[PDB]
């Protein structure tokens, strides 16, 4: 099929979905959650062609994020379930109630978006997951991936239109051949380098774009952190992943600590994981907004939690930022002053993560401050509508001189769980 | 002082406002409200100085939109109210809250999105109500209004600041210079024109910009329409207020309706409100997209529901759009399937407001699918923040091999009313 037919297709099977009970659309979850595992062989077995075809050819940030492992389905196994078990009351949920006047009764609820773009390079695994995260959410959806992932991505598809074909909306789900370049799409979810991005967000005149261009994340090592947990957090959050977005790449260190054996276990852990530092000004005594994604980190030196959080404000992406403190006065300053979308205390940057975070799944993270932030999960893919259901209401006779007043009466409405 | 300088005060002063208690945010919104009654004389004597340098002067347009009555003043002052009475669970609401593992905790809390401009001509009545919806969602804001409005807008501005004084937050709301022209603005919100609309979109590179360019609004007279209700509903959805952005511009009328006297009594009341009607395609038997905001109106026949839907899709602008009929199964398919932001069964194309839908004010009307849509109230001011408390964590020690595992336990979260 042409991609305007792909486009049509993903909308009506999107509607199709949006009008099913949320039990169905559980259903079809689970189900794909089961040929995950079911599966693993033959999902492994295309994803090592994949993997082989790359071989010494495949730039390595994109290698890195090609293969799929037997404990990765493992996790989006899990993860697709606890969307399953958690997404019911998703669609058409009761936001606002509102009697305006007698006979005159408002509301606001949740539905879909209408169809998504999902513009991924690499990333195998990110397909069941936004899969399942629009199935949740009602919403159609086109998937572009790159000619890297092809076998994988063709086997995760089948997969996922196996799923839903238990409940006849097989065309929700449309793989878009990798033919195609970059009214039909009500918003694009880029998943890639900061040029494709970039690329992305400048092509896309009329759809949203929903995600991150970068990820310089900071963590604060105040002068009250445990010496017994500095070493492993900066070690993780910079070497546990270095090409991730929510690596670490700079260090603010308070002041305090430059002459102490806290400091020292610092520069030794680095060295033992063959970390190039370079120092910060203040430090010293090339540039503060860099994105290393590798074994770089900068290292700057701080007055306080106060030049900590301005220094984060300059120059972070607002991603991911982190306090590591045993003080929870200064911590708790730190964490309502800091404004990015995600910050912690005495944990990893790495933790940045929708699976992670007990959203099943992620379609991204988004550093937006409109919409969504942060891990982006079902409910960043809902939009919704104000319905209004009068007699034979007209405005006039509300005015000053009408016959009617406005009561403006909430009614209540269903608590979640 | 300079605007940077405005900037730097109104994000300040933004983030004290965050700081206080939700009952002195509701404080500072009461008196507000309480001066708009209070001042009335001197509110309207400055907006007749206005009113009386716009004669013969100011577009029509701008004109209709300057004038502050009473009624309008005692309308504000009611909906600033119900803001202050009902906006003091908003900021730092608790949204998730979710045990990600033993001693490693998340919860997802709203903040305000920071420092809002809002860019309106003309209009003086918007000035209270996005300061009192900014006021309320924590939010700083500077205000850019035109010279038509000046001395309106200065003595709202005045009130504005008394109000905050008492807890010390003047600097919270900025008024800036109309001598100014079109990393310190999170959000630009403009109230006017098309043509300003379109060229604020375009001069905002980086600064996300929430309104509505246009409002090509439908009614759909359906064949079971009650003819005791069809002339009333038409007339006040296109001559109420003929400028407004929810007046109606395309009347479809069921087929089933060519030959009864209730389309008779249509055409009687669009020729007494001397209303220029132009014919569509089918009925006949210039342009669907067109928003006259005069007493000027497009009728075009169909064949049924799904042709009406099928033509608001098409031609319309996704603002309001509204069905006439007496058949709760057809209205219900309509409300349901129109994908507009508001949809309306029985009442006037003109309900679309954040007042009249109970939210005290709007900041304006959104037609977007991403972030808020329809009428914005305090919350489409908010975002999110993503808060994680750990003891020592890192992401490895839950990998595979790992010690750790997940618990991903959601907790309890106090319910809302």
């Given at each position: 099929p042409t991609v305007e037919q792909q486009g049509e297709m993903?909308?009506?099977?999107?509607?199709?979905?949006?009008?099913?009970?949320?039990?169905?659309?559980?259903?079809?979850?689970?189900?794909?959650?089961?040929?995950?595992?079911?599966?693993?062989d033959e999902i492994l077995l295309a994803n090592k062609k994949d993997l082989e075809e790359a071989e010494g050819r495949l730039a390595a940030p994109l290698l890195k994020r090609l293969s799929l492992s037997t404990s990765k389905l493992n996790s989006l196994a899990i993860?697709?379930?606890?969307?399953?078990?958690?997404?019911?009351?998703?669609?058409?949920?009761?936001?606002?109630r509102t009697?305006?006047?007698?006979?005159?009764?408002?509301?606001?609820?949740?539905?879909?978006?209408?169809?998504?773009?999902?513009?991924?390079?690499?990333?195998?695994?990110?397909?069941?997951?936004?899969?399942?995260?629009?199935?949740?959410?009602?919403?159609?959806?086109?998937?572009?991936?790159?000619?890297?992932?092809?076998?994988?991505?063709?086997?995760?598809?089948?997969?996922?239109?196996?799923?839903?074909?238990?409940?006849?909306?097989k065309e929700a789900v449309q793989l878009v051949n990798t033919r195609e370049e970059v009214k039909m799409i009500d918003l694009i979810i880029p998943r890639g380098s900061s040029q494709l991005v970039r690329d992305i967000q400048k092509a896309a005149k009329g759809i949203p774009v929903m995600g991150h261009s970068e990820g310089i994340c900071h963590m604060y090592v105040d002068s009250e952190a445990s010496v017994d947990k500095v070493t492993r957090l900066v070690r993780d959050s910079k070497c546990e992943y270095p090409a991730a977005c929510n690596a670490l790449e700079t260090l603010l260190i308070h002041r305090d600590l430059l002459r102490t054996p806290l400091f020292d276990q610092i520069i030794d852990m680095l060295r033992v994981e063959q970390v190039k530092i370079h120092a910060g000004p203040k430090f010293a005594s090339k540039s503060l907004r860099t994105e290393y994604g590798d074994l770089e980190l900068c290292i700057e030196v701080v007055d306080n939690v106060?030049?900590?959080?301005?220094?984060?404000?300059?120059?972070?992406?607002?991603?991911?930022?982190?306090?590591?403190?045993?003080?929870?006065?200064?911590?708790?300053?730190?964490?309502?002053?800091?404004?990015?979308?995600?910050?912690?205390?005495?944990?990893?940057?790495?933790?940045?993560?929708?699976?992670?975070?007990?959203?099943?799944?992620?379609?991204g993270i988004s550093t937006s401050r409109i919409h969504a932030r942060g891990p982006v999960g079902l409910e960043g893919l809902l939009t919704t509508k104000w319905?209004?259901?009068?007699?034979?209401?007209?405005?006039?006779?509300?005015?000053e001189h009408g016959s009617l007043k406005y009561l403006h009466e909430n009614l209540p409405i269903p608590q979640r769980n």
């Open positions: 993903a909308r009506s099977g999107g509607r199709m979905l949006a009008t099913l009970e949320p039990e169905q659309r559980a259903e079809i979850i689970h189900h794909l959650a089961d040929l995950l595992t079911d599966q693993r993860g697709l379930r606890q969307i399953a078990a958690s997404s019911q009351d998703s669609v058409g949920r009761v936001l606002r009697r305006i006047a007698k006979n005159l009764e408002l509301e606001q609820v949740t539905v879909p978006i209408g169809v998504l773009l999902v513009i991924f390079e690499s990333r195998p695994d990110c397909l069941p997951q936004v899969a399942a995260l629009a199935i949740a959410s009602g919403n159609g959806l086109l998937l572009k991936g790159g000619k890297e992932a092809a076998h994988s991505n063709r086997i995760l598809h089948l997969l996922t239109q196996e799923a839903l074909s238990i409940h006849g909306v106060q030049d900590a959080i301005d220094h984060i404000h300059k120059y972070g992406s607002s991603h991911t930022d982190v306090i590591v403190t045993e003080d929870e006065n200064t911590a708790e300053f730190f964490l309502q002053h800091v404004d990015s979308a995600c910050v912690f205390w005495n944990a990893s940057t790495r933790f940045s993560d929708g699976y992670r975070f007990g959203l099943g799944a992620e379609v319905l209004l259901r009068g007699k034979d209401h007209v405005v006039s006779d509300f005015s």
